[PDB]
Design a protein around this ligand. Structure first.
Ligand SMILES: CCCCCCCCCCO[C@@H]1O[C@H](CO)[C@@H](O[C@H]2O[C@H](CO)[C@@H](O)[C@H](O)[C@H]2O)[C@H](O)[C@H]1O
Ligand SMILES: CCCCCCCCCCO[C@@H]1O[C@H](CO)[C@@H](O[C@H]2O[C@H](CO)[C@@H](O)[C@H](O)[C@H]2O)[C@H](O)[C@H]1O
Ligand SMILES: [Ca+2]
Ligand SMILES: [Ca+2]
Ligand SMILES: [Ca+2]
Lengths: 102, 102, 102, 102
């Protein structure tokens, strides 16, 4: 029941481009590296890993999932300061492009 | 006694419009779209279903509530990337409107 | 051992004022209301209430506490949208006032 | 495998300085002061104390951890109003800093 959101959302406002939305490329790489780490450090599934990844850089909220090891705990810190920005402007560009599509 | 807040709040300062507080229009569809999905897919009650919809762009904090299913995990990201922006400019506009209200 | 922060922070950086940090006054008033509601509605203690209040507009996070009543649930939803933007500007002005203190 | 984030990130793009990233200095001192507080009050392991301390500036989300003493509740509000904006301006400068590195 989400075909509306996926297609008329975070694939629709992507095909709307300047140059400082090369930040969505940066986010992809910090998000993917994070997902690769949480799967392997923390033993979680990919979807749970991509959930937690995104959860540390948006107001979303981690569910049960949170790190348990020092290595993942620190990584979350290092990652957390780097992604917080790439999310903030991707959310802003993406938000305007909703109101520009109305 | 929530009256003071609902009435001197999300209704009072909601009626200050430029052209760019049609973000509130964009938001209400997106919060609602999310709430239908959460009620139907996640099985939850309207209030709690809305409570999670509003939680993924705001520093409120989602309840015991977190998505348990994959679609509701996937969807929460796609929705969350888009709304986080829509929540912010609205939130600033309303706050802006409280200060020049006294 | 908070006597450091409270004097060298919360009562330090406020003693610096423009026009727009009348925003502190509105946030002050919003939070006190919110706390009274939670103490009265949600039965929680004055700090537990005051903690949740501040929880909902900044990223910090509420540990155990989440509203259990439909009435307090909506109160947080309405109160959430108002307070968040006031949190931004008071939190931003107050942080710049650290930087102009070093 | 955190090395790629640690070195190709939170030190690699940490060392792009204007005048206005003296906040990173200010961050170090206030994040440190909190961690020392959390280690001492909350009994917690320094890492977990540094996990909570950062959790409250960023969209991270504190693990199972939260202030359970009143003073640590009283401290966290005072410190969250101060440190949030510092995590914001550095969050963007480091964000801008990944994009400028393409
Ligand atoms: C006189 C005014 C003329 C300019 C009109 C306005 C166009 C501005 C271009 C901005 O950048 C564009 O956006 C995409 C990304 O930035 C590129 O897409 C694509 O670019 C390549 C084109 O093949 C593909 O390989 C890539 O996958 C994909 O990013 C595209 O090419 C590139 O130009
Ligand atoms: C009337 C005469 C006035 C004198 C002129 C004053 C302004 C000169 C600006 C020179 O630029 C500098 O370049 C460094 C490159 O980033 C900066 O970081 C430097 O400063 C750090 C602080 O010491 C060093 O530790 C680091 O090595 C180093 O990166 C430094 O802050 C910055 O000022
Ligand atoms: Ca959380
Ligand atoms: Ca939230
Ligand atoms: Ca957080």
């Amino acid at each position: 029941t989400l075909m509306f959101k996926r297609f008329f959302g975070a694939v629709r406002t992507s095909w709307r481009d300047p140059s400082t939305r090369g930040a969505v490329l940066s986010l992809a790489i910090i998000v993917t590296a994070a997902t690769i780490f949480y799967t392997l450090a923390e033993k979680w599934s990919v979807i749970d890993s991509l959930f937690y990844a995104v959860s540390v850089g948006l107001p979303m909220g981690n569910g049960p999932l949170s790190p348990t090891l020092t290595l993942s705990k620190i990584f979350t810190l290092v990652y957390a300061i780097l992604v917080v920005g790439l999310f903030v402007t991707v959310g802003g560009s993406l938000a305007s492009a909703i109101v520009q599509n109305n």
